Amino acid sequence: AFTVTVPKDLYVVEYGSNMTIECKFPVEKELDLAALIVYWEMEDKNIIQFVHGEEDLKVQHSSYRQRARLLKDQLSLGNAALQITDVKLQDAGVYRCMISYGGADYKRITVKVNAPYAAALEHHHH
């Protein structure tokens, strides 16, 4: 059966840094992009929906606009690599990578974001 795996489940990053998080999936021979969906989400926010070789932006959460990307060159290696730049505290939480490719599976990744008080206040909402 088709299984997605996460070699590294937990990421600890500093506020304002960039991070790349990864889920791995089986590629038998050559990757067929027509048969692949990669859907990243975190805590009920859509990050990436990548369908038939194209990122669909229609329901991407506005917090990731021009800040999250799928690293497409990694896909042929069976690597779904999500890069998020300028990490904020709202980027801390549980990510899910939902991958469809002759099968479907997901895994959870936990991200922790360290920040000093002044930075935590920057996007502290009421």
From Swiss-Prot:
Induction: Up-regulated on T- and B-cells, dendritic cells, keratinocytes and monocytes after LPS and IFNG activation. Up-regulated in B-cells activated by surface Ig cross-linking. This is Programmed cell death 1 ligand 1. Plays a critical role in induction and maintenance of immune tolerance to self. As a ligand for the inhibitory receptor PDCD1/PD-1, modulates the activation threshold of T-cells and limits T-cell effector response. Through a yet unknown activating receptor, may costimulate T-cell subsets that predominantly produce interleukin-10 (IL10). Can also act as a transcription coactivator: in response to hypoxia, translocates into the nucleus via its interaction with phosphorylated STAT3 and promotes transcription of GSDMC, leading to pyroptosis. The chain holds residues 18 to 134 of 290 of the full protein. The lineage of its organism: Eukaryota, Metazoa, Chordata, Craniata, Vertebrata. Residues 2-110 form the Ig-like V-type domain. It comes from the Eukaryota. It is linked to Truncation of the 3'-untranslated (3'-UTR) region of CD274 transcripts leads to elevated expression of CD274 in multiple cancers including T-cell leukemia, diffuse large B-cell lymphoma and stomach adenocarcinoma. Disruption of 3'-UTR region is caused by structural variants that stabilize CD274 transcripts, leading to overexpression. Increased expression in tumors promotes immune evasion and tumor cell growth by allowing malignant cells to escape destruction by the immune system. Glycans are attached at N18. Interacts with PDCD1. Interacts (via transmembrane domain) with CMTM4 and CMTM6. Interacts with (phosphorylated) STAT3; promoting nuclear translocation. Interacts with CD80. Highly expressed in the heart, skeletal muscle, placenta and lung. Weakly expressed in the thymus, spleen, kidney and liver. Expressed on activated T- and B-cells, dendritic cells, keratinocytes and monocytes. Belongs to the immunoglobulin superfamily. BTN/MOG family. It is found in: Cell membrane; Early endosome membrane; Recycling endosome membrane; Nucleus. Disulfide bonds join C23-C97. Ubiquitinated; STUB1 likely mediates polyubiquitination of PD-L1/CD274 triggering its degradation. Ubiquitinated by MARCHF8; leading to degradation. Deubiquitinated by USP22; leading to stabilization. The gene is CD274.
